[PDB]
Amino acid sequence: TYNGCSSSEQSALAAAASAAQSYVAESLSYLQTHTAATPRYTTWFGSYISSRHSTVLQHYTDMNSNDFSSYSFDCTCTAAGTFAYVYPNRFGTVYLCGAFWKAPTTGTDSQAGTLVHESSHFTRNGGTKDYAYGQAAAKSLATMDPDKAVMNADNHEYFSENNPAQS
Ligand SMILES: *[C@H]1O[C@H](CO)[C@@H](O)[C@H](O)[C@@H]1O
Ligand SMILES: [Zn+2]
């Protein structure tokens, strides 16, 4: 369901959720077939180790079971700089803010990527935290502290967005 959303916002969210679902599905597939270090995995989750890969894999396996199209959206947040927020223990409800709207559907820091970001926040999906914000910061975190990177919402979004595309 939707709360305080316009017609434009509802359709943008439907497509965003559908694009998010596709992001998570391919990311899951990718993780199941790529069992060694690749530029895409290491850029976002740092040095390749099975234990961290299992954690990101589980995150995606759980996120994959999520039905993004059944999520409850709330568009009452007008904070111009914030994309969206969620309560880790209040599953399926995503509150969208101002910045979310000016973002593209897919791509870098997109609406669909934001859903992957927020979704990974749910304790049921793995409960990521907000350690670093942005590609610059996310990549740094992945080279400075892989453990945090695998528990960072943005690093999940960027691995899924994969833009610039890496193999
Ligand atoms: C993460 O590290 C790997 C090397 O193991 C590269 O494939 C990638 O470019 C990134 O630096
Ligand atoms: Zn977050």
Side-chain angles (χ1 to χ4, degrees), residues 1-132 134-167:
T1 54
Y2 302 75
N3 197 51
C5 301
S6 68
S7 61
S8 291
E9 294 170 344
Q10 285 183 45
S11 47
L13 284 162
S18 161
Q21 200 75 74
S22 298
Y23 269 167
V24 176
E26 187 272 331
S27 292
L28 178 59
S29 176
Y30 182 95
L31 286 177
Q32 291 182 315
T33 62
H34 303 74
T35 51
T38 55
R40 189 189 177 173
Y41 176 86
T42 83
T43 296
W44 306 117
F45 299 124
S47 296
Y48 186 92
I49 176 65
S50 314
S51 54
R52 291 185 201 123
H53 179 267
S54 303
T55 297
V56 299
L57 171 65
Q58 184 56 46
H59 288 184
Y60 281 91
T61 301
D62 282 326
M63 282 189 284
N64 190 55
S65 88
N66 286 208
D67 175 7
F68 292 70
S69 293
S70 67
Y71 278 12
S72 285
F73 296 109
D74 185 297
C75 309
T76 63
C77 179
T78 61
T82 303
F83 277 79
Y85 64 87
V86 289
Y87 298 114
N89 291 107
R90 269 153 283 179
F91 178 83
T93 301
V94 176
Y95 306 84
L96 312 125
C97 303
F100 184 84
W101 312 117
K102 294 178 281 177
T105 305
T106 60
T108 300
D109 292 319
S110 58
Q111 304 186 330
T114 295
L115 286 178
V116 170
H117 172 122
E118 302 305 325
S119 176
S120 64
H121 267 333
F122 294 130
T123 63
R124 181 200 297 183
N125 293 327
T128 52
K129 304 291 197 56
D130 283 314
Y131 291 124
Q135 276 207 5
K139 276 190 270 65
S140 291
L141 192 73
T143 177
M144 296 181 109
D145 194 333
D147 296 325
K148 291 301 175 47
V150 310
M151 286 309 290
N152 186 240
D154 261 351
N155 281 253
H156 278 72
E157 170 175 350
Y158 301 142
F159 173 86
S160 294
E161 295 180 336
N162 191 25
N163 185 245
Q166 296 181 268
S167 52

